[model samples]
Target: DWLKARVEQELQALEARGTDSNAELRAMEAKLKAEIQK
Candidate 1:
């Protein structure tokens, strides 16, 4: 399931940021869109 994997990746990336919650979620949203398009 690509969505599951993509979501894991997104969450990992968000975790790596450590304090940029807003930016992380926005970036994750963009990533989700791009992944769906691909």
Candidate 2:
């Protein structure tokens, strides 16, 4: 429960900061997939 609370707090901070975490995660996933293909 503490970990969930901490994660939620961090996510809220990112929202306040105007950070596009989903886009960043998608880019990271694409990069990882590309690397695996090579």
Candidate 3:
């Protein structure tokens, strides 16, 4: 999955997601932490 396509895909998703903040990562961390640990 280290191919260029996957790389660009993640980039586009992240960029298109929003350049406003990293709340995605933080929220995602805490977000998934709850479910993942559960």
Candidate 4:
């Protein structure tokens, strides 16, 4: 019931930011972690 609220807010927060689940898969995951770690 309250789950969609969390999911929806996360979606918008991501849109307000961005993401990258592309390129060399595993390597791309590291890149994402690096950016997030900042």
Sliding window of 10 residues with minimal summed lDDT for model 3 = 29-38
Residues 1-38 of candidate 3 have per-residue lDDT tens digits of 23435445755687687877555655544544354443
The candidate with the higher lDDT, 2 or 3, is 2
TM-score of each: 0.40, 0.39, 0.37, 0.37
Identify the candidate with maximal TM-score: 1
Runs with alpha carbons beyond 4 Å of true place in candidate 1: 1-22
| Tens digits of per-residue lDDT for model 1, 1-38 | 46858687758876787775755576666667677765
**Residues 1-38 of candidate 4: C-alpha lDDT, one tens digit per residue:** 45446545755666556665334445644555455454
Q: Tell me the deviation in Å of residue 22 in model 1.
A: 4.4
Off by over 4 Å in 4: 19-38
Quantify all predictions' global Cα lDDT against the true fold. Answer: 0.70, 0.55, 0.54, 0.51
Model 3, runs deviating above 4 Å:
20-38
Order by lDDT, highest first? 1, 2, 3, 4
Write down the worst ten-residue block by lDDT for model 2.
29-38
Write candidate 2's Cα lDDT for 1-38 as tens digits.
Answer: 35446445755677678755656655544554454454
- Tell me the deviation in Å of residue 32 in model 3: 26
Q: RMSD (Cα, Å) of candidate 1?
A: 3.0
